[PDB]
Amino acid sequence: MSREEVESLIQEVLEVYPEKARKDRNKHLAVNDPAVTQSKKCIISNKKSQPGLMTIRGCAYAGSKGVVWGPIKDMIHISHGPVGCGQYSRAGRRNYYIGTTGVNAFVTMNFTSDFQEKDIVFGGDKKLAKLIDEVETLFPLNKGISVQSECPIGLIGDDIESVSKVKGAELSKTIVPVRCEGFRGVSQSLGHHIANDAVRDWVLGKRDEDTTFASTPYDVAIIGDYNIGGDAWSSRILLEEMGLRCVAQWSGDGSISEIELTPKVKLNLVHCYRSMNYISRHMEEKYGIPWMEYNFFGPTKTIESLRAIAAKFDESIQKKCEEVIAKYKPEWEAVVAKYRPRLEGKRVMLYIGGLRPRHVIGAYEDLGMEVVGTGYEFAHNDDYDRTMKEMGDSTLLYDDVTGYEFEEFVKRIKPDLIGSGIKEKFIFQKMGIPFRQMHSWDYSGPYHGFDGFAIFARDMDMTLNNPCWKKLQAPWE
Amino acid sequence: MSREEVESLIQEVLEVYPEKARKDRNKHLAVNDPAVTQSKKCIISNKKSQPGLMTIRGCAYAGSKGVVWGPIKDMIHISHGPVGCGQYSRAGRRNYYIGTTGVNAFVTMNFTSDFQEKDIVFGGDKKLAKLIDEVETLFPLNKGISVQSECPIGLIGDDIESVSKVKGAELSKTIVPVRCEGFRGVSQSLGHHIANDAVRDWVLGKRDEDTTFASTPYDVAIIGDYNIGGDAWSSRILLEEMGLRCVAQWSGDGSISEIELTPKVKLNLVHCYRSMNYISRHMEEKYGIPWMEYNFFGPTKTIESLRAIAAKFDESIQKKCEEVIAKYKPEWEAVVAKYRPRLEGKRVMLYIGGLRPRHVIGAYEDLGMEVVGTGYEFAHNDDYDRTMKEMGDSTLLYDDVTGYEFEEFVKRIKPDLIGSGIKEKFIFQKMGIPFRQMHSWDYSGPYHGFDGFAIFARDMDMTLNNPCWKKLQAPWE
Amino acid sequence: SQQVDKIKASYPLFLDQDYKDMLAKKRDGFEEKYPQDKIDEVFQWTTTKEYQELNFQREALTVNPAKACQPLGAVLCALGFEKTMPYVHGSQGCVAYFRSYFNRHFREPVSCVSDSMTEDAAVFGGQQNMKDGLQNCKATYKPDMIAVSTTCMAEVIGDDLNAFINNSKKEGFIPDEFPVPFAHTPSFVGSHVTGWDNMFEGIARYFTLKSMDDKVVGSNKKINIVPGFETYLGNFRVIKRMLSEMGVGYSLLSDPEEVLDTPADGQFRMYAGGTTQEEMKDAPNALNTVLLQPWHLEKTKKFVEGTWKHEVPKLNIPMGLDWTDEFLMKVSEISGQPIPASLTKERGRLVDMMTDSHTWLHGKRFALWGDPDFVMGLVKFLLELGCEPVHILCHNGNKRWKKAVDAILAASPYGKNATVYIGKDLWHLRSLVFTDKPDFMIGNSYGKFIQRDTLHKGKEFEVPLIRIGFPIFDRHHLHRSTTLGYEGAMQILTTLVNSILERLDEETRGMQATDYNHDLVR
Amino acid sequence: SQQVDKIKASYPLFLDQDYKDMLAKKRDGFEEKYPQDKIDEVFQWTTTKEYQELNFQREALTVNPAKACQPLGAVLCALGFEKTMPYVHGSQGCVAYFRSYFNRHFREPVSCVSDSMTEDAAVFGGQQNMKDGLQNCKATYKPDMIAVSTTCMAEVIGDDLNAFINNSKKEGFIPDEFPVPFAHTPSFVGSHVTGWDNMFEGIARYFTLKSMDDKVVGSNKKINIVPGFETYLGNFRVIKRMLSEMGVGYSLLSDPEEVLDTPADGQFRMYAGGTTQEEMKDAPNALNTVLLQPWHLEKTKKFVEGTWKHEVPKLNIPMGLDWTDEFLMKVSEISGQPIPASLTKERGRLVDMMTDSHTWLHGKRFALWGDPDFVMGLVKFLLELGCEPVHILCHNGNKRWKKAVDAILAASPYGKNATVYIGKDLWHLRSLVFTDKPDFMIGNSYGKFIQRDTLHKGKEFEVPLIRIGFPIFDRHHLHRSTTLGYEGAMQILTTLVNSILERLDEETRGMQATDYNHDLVR
Ligand code: CLF
Ligand code: CLF
Ligand SMILES: [Cl-]
Ligand SMILES: [Cl-]
Ligand SMILES: [Fe+2]
Ligand SMILES: [Fe+2]
Ligand SMILES: [Se]
Ligand SMILES: [Se]
């Protein structure tokens, strides 16, 4: 389709809306121009969702508990408020870890204060204090507690900060109050920011004056990899084969101690910019630690990233960088040789959260595929700035896409594959369009690194070329 | 029911038949009188089955291959002829064993010559010779081979004896030809006799000149226990706690070497008289080894048997006998105390093969139950002689019962429980009568010995008293 | 590394020696992990009676609940009405979760909207969100009805749904005639099942409260059926099937079976099937109303009895033999239709299966959980099978319900070793399956973590999970199954006995060690 | 010893120390057993490619066959006719086995008689056995038809069934008008499926050969359906259900579904349901005859084409998506009935399930066996699911069939690593699952011993069995399942994907070792 056709598609789709919604949604849909460096000339983002239009977004609790805090494996995270939020988010996100669950690690468990009417009427701070003592008795090897606030906490005027301070002092325990109530902000995004500030205020400074850790010039931290199906592990391996020492992973398979040791590193490597740019900027400001964005989706980006990271260190790391690149060369080349012929020219539309809608484009292009439409649930304009140069001219961009819009765009564009979430999956399969989950990796992965690229290629091929897609029309009609 | 009512029942049931079948079946049905010692005055047995009447009987191959030979664990038994017989009898009988199946033991496998037309037209002797070589190559740890003849072998004039002799000498291997074709005799019974004579002629004499076995005064063999669900093991344990040494088990969990060592024992302990009296008589004639019948069903019979067996040896064994009896006293007393109140006064009808229809009566009586009808598929009059004193006055006896007879007897008698086989089970359950399989133990057992009595009691109770039996009538009819 | 012709996903990739070594270095270098001996010590302690008693003293902490929140149930109830959009007034984060939860269980689309109330609504309330939300929803997704429930923010702030909806109509955001039934659904009261009851009663009120003057009980010759919170397709289907076989006129009120099972034929169908608005309007003309899951339909019952004047029969959930019999007999009495030969034969086939499988079922010990009606029906059927339901857990149960289940247990010798637990969670259940080990668990997918814990103590302590309930996320298409009626009983029986036989085959699969009992025939 | 409160059956009783010690003493004292090192060495050798080569060179020895003999099939065919007694002329031992074999699979009574020929009949033949046998059977069990087959003794002796039955009527042993169809069923030709074909063709001849003069093709406006040897109740049921939904007039010829599923209601029913004599007599007036399992209905086909003048369509067994489509389209063409909306929706629901489950099915490798038509349908459906059916074993297959399956494999990329084996047995298959290990086996209960063998080599080499086929003796009520049509495809799909997920859960259940991949959601 041409720019003019995409513009007219946008206009036809928006005809359904009442005037107020139409005028708003027009500002969140655009036709890409890769010459643009200021996305605030072309698209609006990080605004409230219009009521009644079936946004795909979650809330600040999803962004804090679900995303940033929940993966930290040796702490206990309390879903504080009524029973819903903790139950729906229990083990839904594949933030992988090594541990003994219920004993020293707690990630897939649902701890909650299960608010009842009396907790709403009279407040939950007494219940929270009692809950903390009960946690200590029954889970003695926990290394810290977080309190993840659900909607009612702030609304009823509870003081979880006081409870955290008092109980933390009593038990000589790190207890972190997180004000991530879902009424705050407009999406998962403000939850990231809230969660980052809570790490800064309650955890990250514990070892500021403690110099027992023996540092090396090659110490780094992986910032913003939540280890989905092992993604952080298949990244970590490469960084350490390159001669670096990965002191911390934020927060996939993360431990409280590695978070506390992070201010001792020489370089913060940021994968998810959206969710952890806040704490990365803080660590540069306070500790003088530089940070850099990188991308481990597919061989082209992984190679570029390894080289850019290695360039921050000495010749010895740069030499190991090229050794790593040479090692994996035949492996990814074999992947390309097998799968690229099966996927060449196929067109993909994406819709994901705050990073992957741009970050995976390179991987698709390494298999000869074209990303013809992309968009984000909760990205900000700084994400869109990074997206416009990654997308082709005259491609479609959508911010906080409505269910209706996403369906209607797909009907006209007719992509060969869609990459989105669980609420999207079954709609598009019924339309006869191959679908891959690009949050959960459809229970597969890892997709990061060289080892991840093999699995990514296998997965896109198994689904796009599956025999089921030729069978949707009954031969008699 | 009175004698006259049972007599009346027999005549009423017989009315269905044509005259020839009627006159025959009348001779095979009787009202018990325990004052009779010559059953040849009361009932005819071990005759041909009447055509078309749905006998429950099997054939001589079942009696030889299925019953006597098949359990011998370290030999390979060939079902020689077409594919049916070996397949239907594959692992249908629970003759338990310890071994490495397909390597040193072969019991649950089906080895067959799978006769085709060319084998019928031109003979199977060349195929059998080739088959033997293939067995030796693929199963090198087999310690002997039997050839279990199916119907066509004798009919077509094959000479398996020649093949066995020639191949046996060539390979220095015991290869046993068994002429157990199903056309021979009238039931499983002649298969036992044929099988016993084959053991005699081809196996039992191998060590006649060998003086190396370290004999003791307490050496016995268990003759005629096929270890159904471990029955022979729960008998063996008691004999050895009493100070005896069980040199052989014929043939449950049996090995060829323990069969060959049997002529070295001091006493043959015969459980199944019907199947093994032949070889027991032979061993008394040739080797001077005495034999005695015993019964390990229920505590009363087991105690009586242990004492009678111990009486054949010295004071040391009689002392150990009373120790064994004292050990198990609290165990079986606990079984009786739990289950007899749940079963007291309940009435059972049995129909089984050649031993159990009389042998289990004492066990039922140890739970306060009454055996009101019993009968056998293939018993001889010496079995019926042993039965009439075990059964109550005016009870019903049936030899080679027809399906029609068994159903009609049950309709009038209305037993609380029926104990018979797989072909009977589902008929009687649909009639609302609790049913226990008394061949396979309904995949339970063992039932022999003290440990077996506990399982027997548990099983009769679970079934007779099951909540399902109150539910057959819909509440609206 | 990867070998291109046998690519490894996470399992077993991370078992490669290089990954193993890397993970060991991460642990030792930076995780400050408790020593393995201490981890083992604490694990063993968590399996003890001492730990269980501390565990059962919890007053404030809940761990691994076996319940969800009200609006989840309101959404499910709403989905069962023709061309109806579930709409949850309040916070959008909730709706993403409700949809995903049901997406994962049904493997289907789940359509639901929010009106996206934010922090700003705490000053002024959510009135404008309702106005624009209803208008936007109607225009964009073209439902014929919008069924409104609430999130906890909206309840805490105190938004008056009734007034807000009325004002939306008065100010022209939607036409006066457009149906907008509503229910307050606070997540801090009861559970998901309560939300279903609240939503249903709201819809019933909407279509009938003001139009009672023309209604005559019995005049439409039908029986109303209210299924409650139900996540097995086969359960909606079996009830309709049995009533059709019997020639009984009926209206199933909330019937999502079409919309939760649309074909993959090249189009997405946002709406399919469902209870019609006319079926609700005409429902007071029924002979009576039968509640399939009465222990979460108490509010519905009060409205049906008080306003419709239907003499709702005292029937248990139609699960197992006796209660399916009782259901069919009551339906026969109400309708005047005899129980047909087809259902009599089906009943006898179930009874045949019971006779065939009783020896493996007898005395088998179960731990189980779920919603109150499902749990009591499962308990009843287990007793009918000669099984012992030793740990019966209903997190969202109440005292009256527990008394009812305790009485059922007292009616059978098979209930002698059974205890019913209310307000207890799966961390409580975990202790019970260590300290008083059953043979199996019957539960939802969250049970897999209990099975994992039990295996870690040892193979001899492992308690296998049998998946029956909601949610089931780790197997495919079990939502198509049936638990109600004779058909459901036959499915449950088959599942139980074969789970027993599978486990026995596992325990007897050891060459020369346990395979003496690896029988071909069972 | 036993503890009265917790009685132990054989497993685990014989693991008690006293029993273990006793069994060790028995072995050491009297068994002269090969040393364990030697047993281990030979076991390992039986898993090798060297051993497989020797194994596949067998010419005379068969080990663990995957077939049975002709008269078993004749008996099953005969049971599908109204008030019909199967009667096998020959040796009674055979009939005990046929009945028990089916008893164990269906968990139902199986009625069948012998005429109990003995050794004496070799001189003079079995004529008198037939005379008395037919008279006795008719009087005692009151069938409306007796369907006669043979055991191998009767075949070898050369008894002429036709003459014997004619002489039985001539001499008054049964009435001249009483139906006694017959078929020679030699066990040394083909297999159980051949017996079914021979029996059916005999019955069809009996009722139609002499009355062809008044028949007109298409005059009754029905389609005859011949199911062949079929041991899933769901398969008779689904075919009848689909044709009824279409409004297609039909006659199912041999229908045992009622007699193999009688209710447990306090009476035994020797006969129930079945194809009527009137249906067989009227069959030539059908539009056409469809064979559901054509690869064992070749004799029947020749009779139906040569005598009834029906142009039997070339249809594969209706298994999987494409072949169910083809069946329905051909039935539509013959009957003039359109495919209704209900079946179109069902098809799309199967396709939906395929889209939902394709990622776990993709590339999974299977070994499988069974009868020819069942096997080829399973292979076809596996290809449709994106699975690789790598070892395809059909003991009773033929060269023409193998060519047809090889063609099917050629039409899909998922067939590239597959080989079809005819004349080979489960000892052959055992070697293949060691040397070229698949992910699962799909087969009957005899497969359990192969799984046992694979586990003994190690857990990493274990090949789990998925039980689909005949006989299934070690699970309960699987004979109620369906493999045909969209319903059968849905059932097979569900079984396959959940077998995969069960195994994955086992492999990822290890605490802190493999449970990183023990996902709640799959
Ligand atoms: S935005 Fe929670 S699911 Fe809701 S109705 Fe309250 S219990 Fe139930 Fe985010 S924090 Fe949570 S998920 Fe929503 S409530 Fe707010
Ligand atoms: S009395 Fe065998 S089942 Fe028969 S038709 Fe021949 S193959 Fe088949 Fe006994 S020995 Fe065997 S079981 Fe019978 S045939 Fe004779
Ligand atoms: Cl967990
Ligand atoms: Cl075996
Ligand atoms: Fe689906
Ligand atoms: Fe049955
Ligand atoms: Se857990
Ligand atoms: Se085997």
H helix and E strand count, chain D: 21, 12
Dist. CA D65–CA B111, nearest whole Å: 8
Q: Is the CB of D146 under 6 A from ligand 2?
A: no
Residues B67 and B171 placed together within one structural domain of the fold: yes
The secondary element (H helix, E strand) that includes residue D481 is: none
Q: Is B109 in the pocket of ligand 8 (CB under 6 A)?
A: yes
Would B335 be classed as within a structural domain? no
Looking at the DSSP assignment, which residues form a beta bridge with residue B347? B370
Closest listed residue to residue D349, CA positions, set A426, A477, C271? A426
Say yes or no: D180 and D112 in one domain: yes
Residues C408 and C260 in one domain: no
CB-neighbour burial class of residue D169 (10 A; exposed 0-12, middle 13-18, buried 19+): middle
Residue of chain B whose Cα is closest to the Cα of D91: B183
Q: Is residue B328 part of a domain?
A: no
In a domain, D5, yes or no: no
> Residue D268 CA to chain centroid, in angstroms?
26
B321 is catalytic: no
Same structural domain for residues A53 and A122? Answer: no
Q: How was this structure determined?
A: X-ray
Residue D414 within a domain: yes
In a domain, D56, yes or no: no
Please check whether residues A255 and A188 belong to one and the same domain. no
Catalytic residue among B25, B77, B192, B236: B192
Parent domain of C149:
69-214
Domain region containing B175: 60-202
CA–CA gap between residue B192 and residue B202 (Å, rounded): 15
A151 CB near ligand 1 (under 6 Å): yes
Q: Residue D326: closest CA among chain A residues belongs to which residue?
A: A475
d(CA D47, CA B361): 49
D45 occurs within a structural domain: no
The annotation status of A282 as a binding-site residue, yes or no, is no
In chain D, which residues have their Cβ closer than 8 Å to the Cβ of A430?
Answer: 352, 355
Count: domains in chain A? 3
**Could you confirm whether B380 is annotated as catalytic?**
no
Give the CA count within 13 Å in the CB-facing half-sphere of C451.
Answer: 24
Helix B403-413 vs helix B422-430: crossing angle, to nearest 10: 40
In this structure, the residue with its CA closest to atom 11 of ligand 2 is: B85
Catalytic residues of A: 59, 62, 93, 192
Q: Are residues D141 and D92 in the same domain?
A: yes
Determine if residue A42 is labeled as part of a ligand binding site.
no
**Per the domain annotation, does C261 fall within a domain?**
yes
Q: How far apart are CA D445 and CA D105, in angstroms?
A: 10
Q: In chain C, whose CA is at the least distance from the CA of A124? A: C60
Q: Identify the domain boundary among A300, A317, A334.
A: A317
Please indicate whether residue B431, judged by its CB atom, sits closer than 6 Å to ligand 8: no
- Nearest residue in C to D106, CA atom: C356
CATH number at residue A196: 3.40.50.1980
Q: Are residues D384 and D405 in the same domain?
A: yes
Q: Give yes or no: residues C99 and C196 share one domain.
A: yes
D512: left (phi over 0), alpha (psi -120 to 50) or beta: left
Same domain, yes or no: C246 and C206: no
H or E element at residue D361? helix D341-361
Are chains A and B touching, using the cut-off of 8 Å on CB pairs and a minimum of 3 such pairs?
A: no
| D97 touches B at CB < 8 Å | yes
CB of residue B102 inside a 6 A radius of ligand 8: yes
> Based on the domain organization, do C405 and C384 belong to the same domain?
yes
Which among A426, A418, A401 is positioned nearest to C110, based on CA atoms? A426
Quote the distance between the C-alpha of residue D107 and its chain's center.
15
- On whether B272 is known to bind a ligand per the annotation, the reply is yes
Residue D152 is labelled as binding a ligand: yes
Q: If you measure from the C-alpha of residue C199 to the centroid of ligand 1, how many angstroms do you get, rounded to a whole number? A: 18
Q: Is the omega angle on the peptide bond into residue B34 within 30 degrees of 0, that is, cis?
A: no
Cβ contacts (< 8 Å) between D33 and chain B: which residues?
74, 104, 255
CB under 8 Å to C448, separation ≥6 — which residues? Answer: C465, C474, D505, D518, D520
Give all strands (DSSP E) within B238-336, no chain letters.
245-251, 267-270, 291-293
Instruction: List Cβ neighbours of B17 (8 Å cut-off, separation of 6 or more).
Output: B25, D136, D139, D140
Q: A153 and A229: one domain?
A: no
Q: Please answer yes or no on whether C152 and A151 come within 8 Å at the CB atom.
A: yes
Task: Determine how β-strand C388-394 pairs with β-strand C365-369.
Answer: parallel
The one-character DSSP state at C477 is S
Cα(A93) to ligand 7 centroid in Å equals: 15
The closest of C225, C240, C394 to C312, measured between CA atoms, is C225
Residue D368 DSSP one-character state: E
Same structural domain, D116 and D235: no
Contacts with B145 (C-beta within 8 Å, 6 or more apart), sequence order: B75, B76, B77, B78, B132, B135, B173, B174, B175, B176
Token readout for B162 is 């020649």
D268 touches chain B (CB under 8 A): yes
A18 lies in the same domain as A137? no
> Do D77 and D205 belong together in one domain?
yes
Ligand nearest to the CA of D70: 2
User: Is residue C327 in some structural domain?
Assistant: yes
Give backbone dihedrals phi and psi of A31, rounded to 5 degrees, phi first: -105, 120
Is the Cβ–Cβ distance between D86 and D111 less than 8 Å? yes
Question: Alpha-carbon dihedral of residues C400, C401, C407, C408, nearest 10 degrees?
Answer: 170
Decide if C97 contacts C61 (C-beta within 8 A): no
The ligand 2 atom at the shortest distance from the C-alpha of residue B82 is 7
With respect to residue D43, please indicate whether it lies within any of the assigned structural domains.
no
**C127 CB near a chain A CB, below 8 Å?**
no
Where residue C109 sits, what CATH number does that domain have? Answer: 3.40.50.1980
Which residues of chain D from 460 to 489 reach within 8 Å of chain B, CB to CB?
none
Decide if D145 is inside a domain.
yes
* A461 close to A337: Cβ distance less than 8 angstroms: no
Domain endpoint, select from D286, D319, D352: D319
Nearest to B423 among D23, D92, D103 (CB): D103
Q: How far apart are CA A84 and CA C94, in angstroms?
A: 8
Within-domain flag for A322: no
**Is residue C272 located within the same domain as residue C350?**
no
Q: Which of D329, D351, D384, D414 would you mutate first to test chain A, the one with the most A CBs within 10 A?
A: D351
User: Does D456 contact C511 at a Cβ distance shorter than 8 Å?
Assistant: yes
Q: Is residue B323 part of a domain?
A: no
Q: Say yes or no: A27 and A94 in one domain.
A: no
The answer to whether residues A361 and A456 belong to one domain is yes
Residue in A138, A131, A133 with CA at minimum distance from that of residue A106:
A138
Alpha-carbon dihedral angle through residues C169, C175, C178, C179, given to the nearest 10 degrees: 0
Please choose, from the candidates A423, A393, A430, the residue with its C-alpha nearest in 3D space to the C-alpha of residue A1. Answer: A393
Contact D181, D203 (CB under 8 A): yes
The edge-to-edge listing of strands for the beta sheet with C365-369 is: C419-422, C388-394, C365-369, C440-443, C465-467
Contacts of A139 (CB under 8 A, 6+ apart): A76, A102, A106
Q: In this structure, are residues B40 and B380 in contact, taking their beta carbons and an 8 Å threshold?
A: no
- Token pair, residue C390, equals 């030793």
Beta sheet of C62-63, edge-to-edge order: A175-178, A145-149, A76-80, A111-112, C62-63
Q: Tell whether C369 lies on the interface with A, counting CB pairs under 8 A.
A: no
Which bound ligand lies closest to the C-alpha atom of C188?
Answer: 1
How far, CA to CA in Å, does A469 sit from each of A424, A429, B130, C310? 17, 9, 53, 51
**Domain check: are D450 and D510 in the same one?**
no
- Pairing between strand A29-31 and A396-399? antiparallel
> Domain ends where: C164, C186, C214?
C214
CATH number at residue D493: 1.20.89.10
Looking at the 3D structure of chain C, how many domains does it have?
4
B103 CB near ligand 8 (under 6 Å): no
In eight-state DSSP terms, residue A393 is: T
What b-and-e string marks burial along C445-465, b requiring 16 or more CB atoms within 10 Å of the CB? bbbbbbbbbbbbbeeeebbbb
Q: Are residues C221 and C271 in the same domain?
A: yes
